[PDB]
Design a protein around this motif. Structure first.
Motif, PDB file in Angstrom:
ATOM      1  N   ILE A  79     -84.560  48.473  24.258  1.00  0.00           N
ATOM      2  CA  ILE A  79     -83.303  47.920  23.751  1.00  0.00           C
ATOM      3  C   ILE A  79     -82.239  47.938  24.859  1.00  0.00           C
ATOM      4  N   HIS A  83     -80.318  44.741  26.268  1.00  0.00           N
ATOM      5  CA  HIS A  83     -78.857  44.650  26.208  1.00  0.00           C
ATOM      6  C   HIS A  83     -78.263  44.386  27.573  1.00  0.00           C
TER       7      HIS A  83
ATOM      8  N   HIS D  92     -83.958  41.174  15.142  1.00  0.00           N
ATOM      9  CA  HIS D  92     -82.882  41.824  15.869  1.00  0.00           C
ATOM     10  C   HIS D  92     -82.135  40.878  16.820  1.00  0.00           C
ATOM     11  N   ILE D  93     -80.797  40.973  16.803  1.00  0.00           N
ATOM     12  CA  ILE D  93     -79.890  40.223  17.652  1.00  0.00           C
ATOM     13  C   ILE D  93     -79.038  41.227  18.428  1.00  0.00           C
ATOM     14  N   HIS D  94     -79.091  41.151  19.783  1.00  0.00           N
ATOM     15  CA  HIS D  94     -78.281  41.983  20.658  1.00  0.00           C
ATOM     16  C   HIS D  94     -76.962  41.231  20.800  1.00  0.00           C
ATOM     17  N   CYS D 100     -75.601  45.625  17.597  1.00  0.00           N
ATOM     18  CA  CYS D 100     -76.954  45.167  17.277  1.00  0.00           C
ATOM     19  C   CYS D 100     -76.922  44.684  15.857  1.00  0.00           C
TER      20      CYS D 100
END
Ligand code: MG
Ligand code: MG
Ligand code: NI
Ligand code: NI
Ligand code: NI
Ligand code: NI
Lengths: 138, 142, 142, 134
Positions: A79, A83, D92-94, D100
């Motif tokens: 993650i 990001h 999921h979308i960052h 998130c």
DNA sequence: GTAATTATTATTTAAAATGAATTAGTGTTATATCTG
DNA sequence: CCAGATATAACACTAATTCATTTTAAATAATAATTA
């Protein structure tokens, strides 16, 4: 030298080396090294970012991964990478296969380097059992 | 018992250099992880080459690019998926531009039945791209 | 600034008691988390209710249920999304049964455009259900 | 019965954000608004808890969290794997560095859906959690 | 004999684990407001 | 100012989380022993 014969060591599970050794003879290979070399060459040809399409214009790609969520700090790493990569990561669809398996499709936007980089950075992680990139255009 | 063991590999310096430069120095955690992943890679294509209809833990992802403007294309795609003897888990769609749509169709089941979808869906008029990612689960020591 | 502060609340014992019963019965990490979450909840309400087409940072999820058998319904929905002034991030589809499809459409834009997309899609023949989840991003100190 | 007091630990900006809602909505004190909010939360949580039809229902849980919250992502996946048959998939979308978005598609009866829902929203770092039943 | 391939041990490096230092959450006591 | 009351601030203590630490294991280098 360029042609000089060198050695390199690999640490792994006995199970995995057994599985590897089991494949030497049947596929017409004489040595374990001979096979490993071909597998390296194989990876070097599939993980080639240029020559697919010139000027490396922003293309769309899908990265299919399989990992064990139990692996300590693996999700946090994945993650964090995504990001840090911003708009290059459109979204991720996750399937909880079983207690030790997760399927994930990571949709990416970027140039040949950028995509390649993400396949290697995520695929390179310990616990990421499988990582295959599907290249298209955007 | 499953324990961590070592082993050396003999090759040309230029080949190790190319490996280190193009892959390990471009994001990969270790040389050992790559070797493990390469072993896992071959370990997967074996399960898929083994055409046994008993196993359905062979999960696959079908990546498709199409023009939504093509009449009845979306109608036919959803029809094929609903009809499917395979378990279509879900589909993620990206609206790229006015004439481009990306879909990732996550499938489960029989090798032939899954390739049937790839063949059916990919065969459709307006489906510009269709690539199947043959995948599978792994054990705790794999 | 980045600083954690405290504050007292005066109320009836019976009200705090019934509050702590729902904290255990629903298993919320802390009383403070719930207070923070209901402040956040109210703040998203306020953000959306204050209808200003300037704020394009607004994120929303549209949950739809429809029959894929309804002729060209899927083409019209994708047409609606491609045409949409908002940024349709992605769409996740679940093939429930022969006559049922679930879709979650992730939208980013201004309140009006996000809602027009609901008005249009929900208005379609064959759309059995359409519910919009008005959400928002939160800063480090929110 | 009798009037007692309780403390809440939070960021200064969040209390500032809260304090702005008092006069603006017609309240005398901060405590007045907090009580009213508690009373408002307690009502919608009751009607959601009741009417449990043991039919095969599908639900969508929309969550917003900060991925910087130490192993919060791991915890969420652990909860979902623990009741694996129910959880269909997660998208999921960052959004940004501290946001998130996740859409968790769930399957089951009212009781087994509420169990999974509350286990995620309750987590520290989970800023938003809204369910959609069908 | 030569040279490539395996196996074993050593050194370097990264992952766990431990536990003090710190922080967050809540209960208690005290001052600041409030109303009429 | 006044009671007589709640509202908010300050303080105190407890459960929880960091962080720098040690500890342990994994990854590579080096070298020795085998096989072509
Ligand atoms: Mg890996
Ligand atoms: Mg929360
Ligand atoms: Ni999972
Ligand atoms: Ni589209
Ligand atoms: Ni469907
Ligand atoms: Ni994210």
């Amino acid at each position: 030298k360029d042609d000089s014969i060198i050695r390199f060591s690999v640490s792994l599970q006995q199970n995995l080396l057994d599985e590897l050794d089991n494949r030497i003879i049947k596929n017409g290979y004489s040595s374990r090294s001979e096979l490993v070399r071909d597998m390296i060459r194989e990876k070097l040809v599939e993980d080639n970012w240029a020559e697919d399409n010139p000027n490396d214009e922003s293309k769309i790609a899908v990265l299919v991964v399989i990992y064990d969520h139990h692996q300590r700090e693996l999700n946090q790493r994945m993650i964090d990478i995504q990001h840090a990569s911003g708009t290059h990561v459109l979204c991720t669809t996750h399937i909880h296969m079983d207690e030790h398996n997760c399927l994930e499709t990571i949709i990416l936007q970027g140039n040949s380097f950028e995509i390649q980089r993400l396949q290697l950075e995520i695929g390179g992680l310990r616990g990421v059992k499988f990582a295959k990139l599907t290249k298209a255009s955007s």
